[PDB]
């Protein structure tokens, strides 16, 4: 599948704020909320769509994402999710905004579609 050069630069950027340079602070997001094996109550009564960085990456590669703007929806998704469940007061709450902020920064660097 080939990708739109704006759509290129967000797999670009999704691979840096996903990389070993970050893990600090992308390990919480790195794959789909387990709400067993991290013992969440009403997880799913809060949040109607999880996302997080693997399916995201799998959505950009197989083509899920017309526009850049759809891949941003999905990360902001991402971040929403996890200030609005856990609080912004939390931790993770915390290290997500480090995150988004990153992300945030490198995102309006694309060009138009
Ligand atoms: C993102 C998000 O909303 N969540 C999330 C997602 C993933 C993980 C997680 C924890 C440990 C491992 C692990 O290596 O095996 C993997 C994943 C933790 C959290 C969050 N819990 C949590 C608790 C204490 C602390 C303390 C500092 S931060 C932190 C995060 C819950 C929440 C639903």
Redesign the pocket.
């Known amino acids: 599948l080939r990708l739109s050069e704006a759509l290129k630069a967000c797999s670009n950027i999704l691979k840096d704020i996903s990389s070993q340079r970050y893990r600090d602070l992308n390990?919480?997001?790195?794959?789909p909320?387990?709400?067993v094996?991290?013992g969440?109550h009403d997880?799913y009564d809060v949040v109607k769509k999880a996302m997080?960085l693997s399916t995201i990456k799998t959505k950009l590669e197989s083509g899920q994402y017309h526009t850049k703007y759809d891949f941003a929806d999905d990360v902001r998704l991402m971040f929403n999710?996890?200030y609005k469940?856990?609080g912004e007061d939390?931790?993770?709450?915390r290290?997500?905004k480090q995150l988004q902020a990153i992300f945030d920064e490198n995102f309006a660097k694309v060009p138009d579609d």
């Open positions: 390990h919480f997001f790195l794959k909320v387990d709400v094996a991290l969440l997880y997080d999710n996890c469940y856990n939390s931790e993770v709450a290290v997500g």
